[PDB]
Amino acid sequence: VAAFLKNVWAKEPVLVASFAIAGLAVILPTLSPYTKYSLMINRATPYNYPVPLRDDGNMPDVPSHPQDPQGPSLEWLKRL
């Protein structure tokens, strides 16, 4: 496999760079630790309006004000 690789790198290096770049593009996002943060940043970008909830009496995780402690936070995004 080492003779074939050097032979195709001597004869057709454009195709070797092509298959190498394509293979890295395939197998690399499953190995990267920052692929999680792409999903996290896209789901944290507020396109719509945060339509509020009627306070029934039992919603301890939902804040009453945006500056309240409870709720989803983006400190991981400010820091990274």
Partner 1 sequence: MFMINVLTLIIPILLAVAFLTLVERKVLGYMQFRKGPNVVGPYGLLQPIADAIKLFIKEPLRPATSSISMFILAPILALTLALTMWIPLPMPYPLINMNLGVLFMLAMSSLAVYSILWSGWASNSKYALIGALRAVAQTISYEVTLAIILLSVLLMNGSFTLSTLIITQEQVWLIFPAWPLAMMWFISTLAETNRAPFDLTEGESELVSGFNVEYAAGPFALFFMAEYANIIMMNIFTTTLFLGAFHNPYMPELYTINFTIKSLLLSITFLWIRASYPRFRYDQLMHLLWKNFLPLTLALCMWHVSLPILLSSIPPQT
Partner 2 sequence: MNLMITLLTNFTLATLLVTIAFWLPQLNVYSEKTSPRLPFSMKFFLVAITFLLFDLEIALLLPLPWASQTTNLNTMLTMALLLIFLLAVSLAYEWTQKGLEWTE
Partner 3 sequence: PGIVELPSLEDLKVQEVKVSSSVLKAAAHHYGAQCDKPNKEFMLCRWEEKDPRRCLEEGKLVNQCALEFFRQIKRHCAEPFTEYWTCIDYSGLQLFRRCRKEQAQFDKCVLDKLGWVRPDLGELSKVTKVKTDRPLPENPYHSRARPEPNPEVEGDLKPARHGSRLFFWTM
Ligand X SMILES: CCCCCCCCCCCCCCCCCC(=O)OC[C@H](COP(=O)(O)OCCN)OC(=O)CCCCCCCCCCCCCCCCC
Ligand Y SMILES: CCCCCCCCCCCCCCCCCC(=O)OC[C@H](COP(=O)([O-])OCC[N+](C)(C)C)OC(=O)CCCCCCCCCCCCCCCCC
Site string for partner 2, 1-40 (x = CB under 8 A): ---------------------x--xx--x--------xx-
Nearest of 66, 74, 65 to residue 43 by alpha carbon: 74
In the block, tokens 């690399």 appear at 28
Q: Taking CB within 5 to 8 Å according to partner kind, which of partner 1, partner 2, partner 3, none is near residue 43?
A: partner 2
* Half-sphere exposure at residue 20, Cβ-oriented, CA atoms within 13 angstroms: 9
**Least gap, CB of 28 to ligand Y (angstroms):** 10
Q: Are 8 and 15 in contact (CB under 8 A)?
A: yes
- For 55, the token pair is 């306070």
Residues that bind partner 1 (CB under 8 A): 14-15, 17-22, 24-26, 28-29, 32, 34-38, 41-42, 45
